[PDB]
A paper describes a structure:
Mutations of human [name] are associated with hyperparathyroidism-jaw tumor ([name]-JT) syndrome, which is an autosomal dominant disorder characterized by parathyroid tumors, fibro-osseous jaw tumors, cystic kidney lesions and uterine tumors. PAF1C participates in recruitment of histone modification factors and promotion of transcriptional elongation. To understand how the [name] N-terminal domain contributes to [name] functions and how [name] pathogenic mutations may lead to [name]-JT and other diseases, we have characterized the structural features of the [name] N-terminal regions and revealed a previously unidentified N-terminal globular domain. Here, we demonstrate that [name]-NTD can form a well-folded globular domain, and is conserved from human to yeast.
LC-MS/MS analysis revealed that this protease-resistant fragment contains at least the first N-terminal 100 residues and likely the first 111 residues of [name]. We thus named this protease-resistant region as [name]-NTD. Furthermore, we have determined a crystal structure of [name]-NTD at ultrahigh 1.02 Å resolutions and characterized [name] pathogenic missense mutants using biochemical assays. First, we determined the crystal structure of [name](1–100) using the SAD method (with a soaked platinum derivative) at 1.4 Å resolution, and then the crystal structure of [name](1–111) at 1.02 Å resolution. There are one and two molecules in each asymmetric unit for [name](1–111) and [name](1–100) crystals, respectively. The overall structure of [name](1–111) is almost identical with [name](1–100), with a r.m.s.d. of Cα positions being 0.894 Å. The extra 11 residues of [name](1–111) pack tightly on surface of the [name](1–100) core structure. Indeed, our Thermofluor assay showed that [name](1–100) and [name](1–111) have Tm values of 46 °C and 56 °C, respectively.
Residue numbers in the entry: 1 to 111
Amino acid sequence: MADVLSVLRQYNIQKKEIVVKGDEVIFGEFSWPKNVKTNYVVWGTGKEGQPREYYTLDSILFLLNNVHLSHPVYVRRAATENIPVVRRPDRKDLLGYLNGEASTSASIDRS
């Protein structure tokens, strides 16, 4: 298996069933907690030697499952659910990666 975000991308591209049970997100045999950190850097972080920060799986999955909402409505929904938001400058790039428009991102740190 690759990293969790790459697995999420694979499942999304194939439209394979993803199971959310409690705080687990399940991809076939594999499971991660909702709060696992992905390798996608949050816009605005990692400047001037300061730490990079990363979106959680929950944050990314919540965006993916709510792509039909306008970004402003999505921001409000995310607040209601207490799930951190994907920042607007990351939205198009992250969704394009998840949908297989791209196979990497300048925001993904992956050795």
